[PDB]
């Protein structure tokens, strides 16, 4: 239903603007598939409402950056788990700390 479409649009946009699209809430979002077809951006006449288009583009870039951060951490975890196949002092003196 289009009510669920606009509601998911608004909750995704308000999740985007208060900065909580982390590396885990990324893959369960579909703001890109509402950005592609411009049916939510067109308000009133045929002209694009650029206010919510700008907010949607900011949320879309947030989703994309969090997704590449997620693939960075996933490749780091896989590189660690595969690089474990292969099976000098941090103390400093007290002049540096005072």
Partner 1 sequence: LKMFIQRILAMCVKNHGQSSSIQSSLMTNLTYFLHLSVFNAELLKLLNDEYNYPQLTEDILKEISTRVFNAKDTTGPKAISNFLIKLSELSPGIMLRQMNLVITLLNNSSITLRCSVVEACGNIVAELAQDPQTMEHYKQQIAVLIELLEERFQDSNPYVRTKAIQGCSKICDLSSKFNKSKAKFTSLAVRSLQDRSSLVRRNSVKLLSKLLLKHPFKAIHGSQLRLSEWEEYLKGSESQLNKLKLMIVYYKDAIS
Partner 2 sequence: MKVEELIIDGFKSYATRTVITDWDPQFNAITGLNGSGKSNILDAICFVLGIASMSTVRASSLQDLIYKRGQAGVTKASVTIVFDNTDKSNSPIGFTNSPQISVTRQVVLGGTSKYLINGHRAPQQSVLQLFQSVQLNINNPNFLIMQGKITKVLNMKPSEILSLIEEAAGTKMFEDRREKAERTMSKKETKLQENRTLLTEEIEPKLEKLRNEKRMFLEFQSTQTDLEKTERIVVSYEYYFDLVRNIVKQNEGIDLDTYRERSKQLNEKFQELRKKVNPNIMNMIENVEKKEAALKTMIKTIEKDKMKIQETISKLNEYKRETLVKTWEKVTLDFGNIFADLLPNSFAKLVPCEGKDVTQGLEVKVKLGNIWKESLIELSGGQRSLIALSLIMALLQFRPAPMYILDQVDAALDLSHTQNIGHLIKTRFKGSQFIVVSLKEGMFANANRVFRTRFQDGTSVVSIM
Residue ranges binding partner 2 (CB under 8 A): 17-19, 32-33, 35-36, 38, 41, 47-48, 50-51, 53-55, 57-58, 60-61, 63-65, 67-68, 70-72, 74-75, 77-79, 81-83, 85
Residue 8 or 64 having the CB closest to partner 2: 64
- Residue partners of 23: CB distance under 8 A and separation at least 6: 66, 69, 70, 73
Q: Are 47 and 38 in contact (CB under 8 A)?
A: no
Helix (H) or strand (E) holding 12: helix 2-17
- 10, 43, 54, 77: which one binds partner 1 (CB under 8 A): 77
Q: Is 39 in the site for partner 1 (CB under 8 A)?
A: no
Burial class (CB in 10 A: 0-12, 13-18, 19+), 50: exposed
How many chain residues touch partner 1 (CB under 8 A)?
Answer: 22
Residues of the shown chain interacting with partner 1 in the complex, contacts defined by CB under 8 A? 72-73, 75-77, 79-81, 83-84, 86-94, 96-98
């Amino acid at each position: 239903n289009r009510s669920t479409m606009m509601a998911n649009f608004e909750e995704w946009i308000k999740m985007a603007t208060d900065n909580k699209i982390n590396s885990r809430n990324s893959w369960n979002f579909a703001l890109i598939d509402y950005f592609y077809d411009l049916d939510v951006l067109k308000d009133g006449e045929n002209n694009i409402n650029f206010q919510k288009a700008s907010a949607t583009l900011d949320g879309c870039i947030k989703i994309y950056s969090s997704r590449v951060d997620s693939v960075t951490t996933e490749t780091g975890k896989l590189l660690s788990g595969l690089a474990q196949r292969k099976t000098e002092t941090t103390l400093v003196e007290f002049e540096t700390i005072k």
